[PDB]
């Protein structure tokens, strides 16, 4: 296998967050949810998809943001949409005008109230009035339902009164007066008997009998939810001391008991019930299960998050951590993507979360060690070329110092140099740099291709910094140049060019070419910086080599062999004076003679 | 130089082999000292350092340094002798007593493990003992993660030990001979028996913690399986077939793992990578599912 399937999916999702981050940065109006809804259409997602539409309706669906009110609206609108669609398709085309009332009459008449019509409704002039009121109510068209009742020809008319004021108010029709009276009538007359829809209207409007369920006409799971939502009374529930209060909390618990995901079958639908019910945490957790698609749970959470929920990793709900853990999968492979996800953490605006974000990024940089990608790269003057994080911005200098110091512990030189460049500690960079180039200079030969490494690194920095307003110490730079000179000597040492090597070595002004001034070379030796003091071993012996090979005794006129001979002599006196302060290879002698 | 330390290392090996010490408590001390010594000798260095040293030896162009390699060789010789004897003692001991001293002995076994990887041990150890016991203990690992809640406490003991056991298993798998021994011990079978994989973790303490923990077990076991697979000849070899069966039988978990988030995500991400490595490493699980 291979499952390009997810990776493709991973990328598609990553793409969407990426665009979302671009919008936030660019102050755009990109909707997250529409974006998923578009993709989600394809399949299995037909659940996840409905979930997204639920969230989207919530877009700016605050509009204040009342839990049950919005859930009710979603269910009510969904039903309405369903109704409109049925009407919107042949018939008659319904005979009359497209009014909402007629659309519902159509649903009731054409849709499945009749296979070929009949049974136990109260009907006048071919129309079940109570069913109509119930469905209109279901649609959210309370006003119309009220009007139907008004016109009704009925004789429970006291109820008619109680419908109108239920409607007039916020729909929590609370008269300090009659509600009590309505309840008694329900129990005595209505409760043991009647037309199912009539009972529904009384029960639902009245909140008559808190033991809950409507016998005959609960036909759908959403019908089931809607009914329950209607029943709860949030406001001024605490006030009034009867225990006929039904709360969202109570509703939420019932959904938990057993009702269970299994019970909400279409398990498919359970997800939606959780969102509607306000069990966001549970909802993410539930999405957290099949394949939960950790990916899906993460993004949904992101969406709830945009909504400003999350108001206080299979089972770990906190947004920061949900995101962070998600990153664990891909972070090594796709550090850029990880950054994009971590960035969402800020979406929950407030301190704490902000630090969590910062810590997460800091944690990402450390141990991923993707410095160039994350932090930045190469100056060519022109400061840093921004890393992905920098595009996001801010605390970046302190992270660098932290990382760089750590590099120092590990001894990950190169990383340290890289980090310090970003730090813009120019002096520090060269000094670390001198050390790196300095060793690797002393050693044994056969190396140094002309294109890449510590030497090459050396060349980069010098060209780079020195011309430009150089902040480094003169001393530091000086050793730097010396190391470079010695290196060029290496390039030309071997690959022929014997003569050229002597010229350059002499230029170094380290080794006595002149007279017996070898000793002055002693006096100036101990003074030498640690980096050079180490390198001298090869300087000598390079000299006695070229000196040897060049001064190969020639065949058969001016031939001044004497020089390039005196040079060896002075050099040997030099080597003779400091052998103890040298590694211990006066095997200059072997090359010296023949 | 920790030469002076070397002598103590020898004494420690001597006592352990002797298995004198009514107290496992005593042996725990021996294990601890040995552990530090093994760790101390190789300050964290990785294959790069070894390669550099070899080149320098390259050959003794001039005067080379081969100090750390020489030190490791001396340690390994000492250890070998004493070794067969002591391996017996260390494993049996293991089990019991000391769930305590355990934290100490499993850590000692793992350090030792790198060094003396390769060699020696594989043969000795193999046989015995260990394998049989360790595979059976995989099964029981699943059961042990549940018992995990209870014992959170007795957890301290065992985290020091159970994690150490997984590590020991992973290390054996990294090499050819070790992987063979684990597989011979019937690794796939024990894993089937543990039933760690043949389930869904989400199904089911703060829930994100349990998911992190369960997924955590899954990542190490999955690494052990991937390592055993690759470490043989993953191709026509028998190993490839066994791993494929592993994937297909525990399919849909692999698929399910692919999407979501948290530290839990981090563990999930690692698990996902591990499956991917298993996939390509075998006959492409996809390739097989033509």
Q: Are B63 and A583 in contact (CB < 8 Å)? A: yes
Q: Considering only the beta carbons, identify the residue of A290, A327, A332 that sits closest to B256.
A: A290
End-to-end CA distance of chain B: 60
Judge whether A505 and A543 are in contact, CB under 8 Å: yes
**354-413 of A, contacting B, C-beta below 8 A:** 410
Q: Are B261 and A585 in contact (CB < 8 Å)? A: no
End-to-end CA distance of chain A: 69
Q: Considering only the beta carbons, identify the residue of B207, B209, B279 that sits closest to A1.
A: B279
**Per-residue tokens: B22:** 């009514």
Beta strands in A466-573 (DSSP E): none
Q: Are A313 and B260 in contact (CB < 8 Å)? A: yes
DSSP labels, B13-53: HHHHHHT--S-HHHHHHHHHHHHHHHHHHS-S--HHHHHHH
Q: Are B208 and A294 in contact (CB < 8 Å)? A: no
**Distance to chain B for A296, nearest Cα, Å:** 6
Indicate which of B265, B266, B280 best probes the interface with A, i.e. most A CBs within 10 Å of its own CB. Answer: B265
Distance CA A503, CA A28 (A): 66
Distance CA A426, CA A431 (A): 9
User: Any alpha helices (H) in A264-352, and if so which ranges?
Assistant: 270-277, 280-287, 294-306, 319-330, 335-343
Three-class SS state of B97: strand
**Distance to chain B for A511, nearest Cα, Å:** 23
Distance CA A241, CA A243 (A): 7
Stated resolution in angstroms: 21.4
Q: Which residues share a beta bridge with A127?
A: A124
Q: Are B270 and A585 in contact (CB < 8 Å)? A: no
**Residue (of A98, A101, A180, A193) closest to A147 by Cα position:** A101
Indicate which of B260, B263, B279, B282 best probes the interface with A, i.e. most A CBs within 10 Å of its own CB. Answer: B260
Distance CA A401, CA A428 (A): 12
Q: Are A314 and B287 in contact (CB < 8 Å)? A: no
Q: What angle do CA A562, A567, A572 make, to 5 degrees?
A: 125
**62-121 of A, contacting B, C-beta below 8 A:** none
Cα dist from B14 to A409, A451, B8, whole Å: 36, 55, 10
A452/B contact by beta carbon, under 8 A: no
**Distance to chain B for A291, nearest Cα, Å:** 4
- Which residues have a C–N gap over 2.5 Å right after them in chain A? 62, 92, 258, 266, 291, 312, 556
DSSP labels, A360-402: HHHHHHHHH--HHHHHEE--SSS-PEE-HHHHH-SS-HHHHHH
Cα dist from A101 to A78, A83, A110, A117, whole Å: 16, 11, 14, 20
Contacts of B71 (CB under 8 A, 6+ apart): B41
Cα dist from A117 to A109, A113, A123, A215, A590, whole Å: 8, 7, 12, 21, 119
Distance CA A8, CA A12 (A): 6
Buried b (16+ CB within 10 A) or exposed e, A308-334: ebbeebbbbbbbbbbbbbbbbbbbbeb
Residue A261 CB-half CA count within 13 A: 14
Distance CA A198, CA A201 (A): 5
User: Any alpha helices (H) in chain B, and if so which ranges?
Assistant: 3-18, 24-41, 47-57, 67-96, 99-116, 122-125, 131-147, 155-174, 176-184, 187-194, 208-231, 238-249, 253-257, 263-281, 285-288
Judge whether B9 and B37 are in contact, CB under 8 Å: yes
**Residue (of A418, A450, A443, A402) closest to A585 by Cα position:** A443
Q: Which residues share a beta bridge with B13?
A: none
Q: Are B203 and A289 in contact (CB < 8 Å)? A: yes
A493/B contact by beta carbon, under 8 A: no
Judge whether B240 and B282 are in contact, CB under 8 Å: yes
**Residue (of A261, A273, A262) closest to A221 by Cα position:** A273
Q: Considering only the beta carbons, identify the residue of B252, B267, B286 that sits closest to A2.
A: B286
Q: Are A296 and B210 in contact (CB < 8 Å)? A: no
Q: Are A3 and B212 in contact (CB < 8 Å)? A: no
A341/B contact by beta carbon, under 8 A: yes
**Tokens 């970046």 found at:** A396
Q: Are B263 and A313 in contact (CB < 8 Å)? A: yes
Residue of A nearest to B60 (CA): A444
**122-161 of A, contacting B, C-beta below 8 A:** none
State the SS3 of A124-175: ECCEEHHHHHHHHHHHCCHHHHHHHHHHCCCCCCHHHHHHCCCCCCCCCCCC
Q: Considering only the beta carbons, identify the residue of A3, A289, A328 that sits closest to B267.
A: A328
Contacts of A324 (CB under 8 A, 6+ apart): A342, A345, A360, B261, B262, B263, B265, B266
**Tokens 């990542």 found at:** B219
**Tokens 């355990």 found at:** B102
Residue of B nearest to A585 (CA): B62
Distance CA B214, CA B204 (A): 10
Q: Considering only the beta carbons, identify the residue of A7, A296, A328 that sits closest to B270.
A: A328
**Tokens 């089990």 found at:** B95
Residues in chain A: 594
Contacting residues of B for A324, CB less than 8 Å apart: 261-263, 265-266
């Amino acid at each position: 296998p291979g499952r390009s399937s997810l990776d493709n999916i991973e990328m598609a999702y990553a793409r969407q967050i990426y665009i979302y981050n671009e919008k936030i940065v660019n102050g755009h109006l990109q909707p997250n949810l529409v974006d998923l809804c578009a993709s989600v259409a394809e399949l299995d997602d037909k659940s996840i998809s409905d979930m997204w539409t639920m969230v989207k309706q919530m877009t700016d669906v605050l509009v204040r943001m009342e839990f049950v009110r919005q859930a009710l609206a979603y269910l009510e609108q969904s039903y309405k949409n369903y109704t409109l669609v049925t009407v919107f398709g042949n018939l008659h085309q319904l005979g009359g005008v497209p009014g909402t009332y007629q659309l519902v009459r159509s649903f009731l008449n054409i849709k499945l109230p009749a296979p070929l019509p009949g049974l136990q409704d109260g009907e006048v002039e071919g129309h079940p009035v109570w069913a109509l009121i119930y469905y209109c109510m279901r649609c959210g068209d309370l006003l119309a339902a009220s009007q139907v009742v008004n016109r009704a020809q009925h004789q429970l008319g006291e109820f008619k009164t109680w419908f109108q004021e239920y409607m007039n108010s916020k729909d929590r029709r609370l008269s300090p007066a009659t509600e009590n009276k309505l309840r008694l009538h329900y129990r005595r007359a209505l409760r043991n008997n009647t037309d199912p829809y009539k009972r529904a209207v009384y029960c639902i409007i009245g909140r008559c009998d808190v033991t809950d369920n409507q016998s005959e006409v609960a036909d759908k799971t959403e019908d089931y939810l809607w009914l329950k939502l209607n029943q709860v009374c949030f406001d001024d529930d605490g006030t009034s001391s009867p225990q006929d209060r039904l709360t969202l909390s109570q509703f939420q618990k019932q959904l938990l008991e057993d009702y269970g995901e299994s019970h909400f079958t279409v398990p498919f639908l359970y997800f939606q019930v959780l969102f509607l019910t306000a069990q966001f945490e549970a909802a993410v957790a539930f999405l957290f299960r099949m394949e939960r698609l950790r990916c899906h749970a993460v993004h949904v959470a992101l969406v709830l998050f945009e909504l400003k929920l999350l108001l206080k990793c299979l089972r770990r709900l906190n947004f920061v951590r949900l995101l962070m853990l998600y990153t664990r999968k891909f972070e090594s492979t796709d550090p850029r993507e990880a950054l994009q996800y971590f960035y969402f953490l800020r979406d929950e605006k407030d301190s704490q979360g902000e630090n969590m974000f910062l810590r997460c990024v800091s944690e990402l940089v450390i141990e991923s060690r993707e410095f160039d990608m994350i932090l930045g790269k190469l100056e060519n003057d022109g400061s840093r070329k921004p890393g992905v994080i920098d595009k996001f911005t801010s605390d970046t200098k302190p992270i660098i110092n932290k990382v760089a110091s750590v590099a120092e512990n590990k001894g990950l030189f190169e990383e340290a140099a890289k980090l310090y460049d970003l730090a813009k500690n120019a002096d520090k960079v060269l000094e670390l740099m001198n050390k790196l180039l300095s060793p690797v200079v002393p050693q044994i030969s056969a190396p140094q291709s002309n294109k890449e490494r510590l030497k090459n690194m050396a060349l980069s920095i010098a060209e780079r910094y020195r011309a430009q307003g150089i902040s480094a110490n003169k001393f530091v730079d000086s050793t730097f140049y010396l190391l470079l000179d010695l290196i060029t000597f290496f390039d030309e040492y071997h690959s022929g060019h014997i003569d050229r090597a002597f010229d350059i070595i002499e230029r170094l002004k380290l080794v006595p070419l002149n007279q017996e001034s070898v000793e002055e070379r002693v006096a100036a030796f101990r003074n030498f910086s640690d980096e050079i003091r180490h390198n001298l071993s090869e300087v000598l012996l390079a000299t006695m080599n070229i000196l040897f090979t060049q001064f190969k005794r020639l065949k058969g006129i001016e031939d001044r062999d004497s020089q390039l001979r005196s040079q060896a002599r002075t050099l040997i006196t030099f080597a003779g004076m400091i052998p103890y302060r040298t590694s211990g290879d006066t095997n200059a002698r072997l090359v010296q003679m023949e | 130089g920790d030469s002076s330390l070397y002598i103590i290392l020898k004494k420690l090996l001597d006592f352990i082999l002797k298995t004198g010490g009514g107290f496992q408590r005593v042996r725990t001390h021996l294990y601890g000292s040995l552990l530090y010594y093994l760790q101390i000798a190789q300050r964290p260095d990785e294959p790069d350092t070894l390669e550099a040293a070899k080149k320098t030896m390259w050959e003794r162009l001039t005067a080379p340094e081969d100090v750390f390699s020489k030190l490791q060789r001396e340690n390994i010789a000492i250890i070998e002798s004493y070794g067969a004897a002591l391996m017996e003692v260390v494993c049996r001991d293991a089990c019991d007593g000391h769930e305590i001293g355990r934290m100490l002995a499993l850590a000692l076994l793992d350090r030792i493990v790198s060094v003396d990887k390769q060699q020696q041990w594989l043969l000795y150890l193999s046989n015995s003992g260990y394998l049989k016991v360790l595979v059976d203990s995989l099964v029981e690992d699943d059961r042990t993660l549940q018992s995990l809640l209870t014992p959170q406490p007795p957890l301290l003991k065992a985290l020091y030990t159970y994690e150490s056991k997984m590590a020991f298993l992973t290390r054996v798998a990294k090499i050819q001979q070790g992987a063979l021994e684990l597989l011979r011990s019937g690794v796939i079978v024990r894993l089937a028996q543990c039933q760690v994989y043949d389930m869904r973790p989400e199904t089911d303490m703060f829930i994100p913690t349990p998911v992190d923990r369960y997924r955590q077990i899954l990542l190490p076991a999955l690494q052990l399986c991937q390592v055993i697979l690759t470490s043989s000849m993953a191709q026509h070899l028998q190993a490839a077939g066994q791993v494929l069966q592993f994937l297909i039988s525990h399919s849909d978990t692999i698929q399910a793992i692919l999407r979501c988030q948290d530290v839990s995500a981090g563990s999930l991400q690692e698990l996902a990578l591990l499956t991917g490595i298993i996939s390509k490493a075998a006959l492409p699980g996809i390739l097989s599912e033509l």
